[PDB]
Amino acid sequence: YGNIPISMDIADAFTRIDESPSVSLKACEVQSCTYSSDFGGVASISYTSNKVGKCAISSNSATMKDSVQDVQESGALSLFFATSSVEPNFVVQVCNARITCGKCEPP
Amino acid sequence: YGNIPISMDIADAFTRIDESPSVSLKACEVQSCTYSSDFGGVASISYTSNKVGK
Amino acid sequence: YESTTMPNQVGIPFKALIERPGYAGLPLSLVVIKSELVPSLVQDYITCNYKTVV
Amino acid sequence: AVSVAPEPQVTYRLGEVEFHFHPMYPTLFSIRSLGKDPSHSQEWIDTPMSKTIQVGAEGVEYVWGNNNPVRLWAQKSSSSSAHGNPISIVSHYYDLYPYWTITVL
Numbered sequence: 001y002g003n004i005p006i007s008m009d010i011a012d013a014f015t016r017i018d019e020s021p022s023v024s025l026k027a028c029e030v031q032s033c034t035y036s037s038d039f040g041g042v043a044s045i046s047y048t049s050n051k052v053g054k055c056a057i058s059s060n061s062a063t064m065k066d067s068v069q070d071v072q073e074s075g076a077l078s079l080f081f082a083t084s085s086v087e088p089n090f091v092v093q094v095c096n097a098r099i100t101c102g103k104c105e106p107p
Numbered sequence: 108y109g110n111i112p113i114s115m116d117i118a119d120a121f122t123r124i125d126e127s128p129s130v131s132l133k134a135c136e137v138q139s140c141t142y143s144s145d146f147g148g149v150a151s152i153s154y155t156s157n158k159v160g161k
Numbered sequence: 162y163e164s165t166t167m168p169n170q171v172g173i174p175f176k177a178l179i180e181r182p183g184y185a186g187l188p189l190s191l192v193v194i195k196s197e198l199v200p201s202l203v204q205d206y207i208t209c210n211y212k213t214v215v
Numbered sequence: 216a217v218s219v220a221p222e223p224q225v226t227y228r229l230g231e232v233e234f235h236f237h238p239m240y241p242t243l244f245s246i247r248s249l250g251k252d253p254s255h256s257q258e259w260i261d262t263p264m265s266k267t268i269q270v271g272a273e274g275v276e277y278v279w280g281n282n283n284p285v286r287l288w289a290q291k292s293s294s295s296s297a298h299g300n301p302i303s304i305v306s307h308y309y310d311l312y313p314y315w316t317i318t319v320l
Binding site: 108109110111112113114115116117118119120121123124125126127160161 | 162163164165166167168169177178179180181183184185186187188189191193196
């Protein structure tokens with residue numbers, strides 16, 4: 001309980017910008033949809049990359065358990081998510097690029 | 108006689124994905140067609156994949 | 162979590178995956194070779210040939 | 216050094232935790248909550264009885280004799296995956312709290 005506003009100078013510049021992946025064909029698959037309340041999350045996203053780098057990822061309306069991924073080439077990438085914790089909605093980003101997801105809610 | 112309900116809790120996670128190849132060029136060839144029905148089906152399915160997995 | 166319904170038809174292989182969605186590389190295959198009705202009985206009586214002696 | 220009886224077996228269902236209490240000789244048990252609105256009771260379980268408490272990933276704690284308390288968020292070997300409407304709603308498909316029955320009305 002209680003919220004912590006935080007502020008940072010992370011010593012930006014560095015030698016930015018000199019890496020920045022971009023990503024194309026952005027998709028969401030939904031697997032492991034069960035109607036049990038757990039905190040886990042087990043889904044995959046399909047995309048293709050051809051830009052070799054690390055971007056700062058990911059997101060400000062979604063939560064991945066990864067955050068550093070050197071993407072040189074890409075396919076299906078399974079990631080873990082904090083579902084039914086503090087995200088019941090997700091705006092999924094992989095770098096500057098994005099889509100909104102996902103599915104599973106029957107009446 | 109009847110139907111048999113079955114229930115199992117089986118460990119299949121592992122690590123998910125356990126590899127799912129995306130698949131293209133999906134086709135159905137049907138051959139070996141000769142009348143009767145007290146024996147099993149014979150179909151051949153053609154496809155092409157972009158990954159190896161199970 | 163659980164729970165599928167196969168019909169009882171013998172020698173046909175059924176495949177179940179279940180624990181949660183997604184793909185597995187080892188899944189459960191089960192086949193019925195046979196159902197077997199085995200008695201649990203009350204002996205009503207016994208009768209047999211008898212040797213009547215005059 | 217002390218030993219008291221087995222801590223209750225857990226069984227799990229869709230958004231549901233059920234507990235089978237199982238003693239040897241009279242064992243003090245407490246039913247509490249701190250992932251939910253405050254409650255306290257104490258009772259002795261001398262003979263098994265099932266108590267079902269629902270937990271939708273909130274937190275329910277049970278205290279059994281001289282053993283560590285166990286709090287659970289109804290953890291299993293399953294997960295969700297982008298469930299729930301963007302504007303606030305209840306866990307699982309189920310109508311209660313009415314937010315699936317409000318659209319019908």
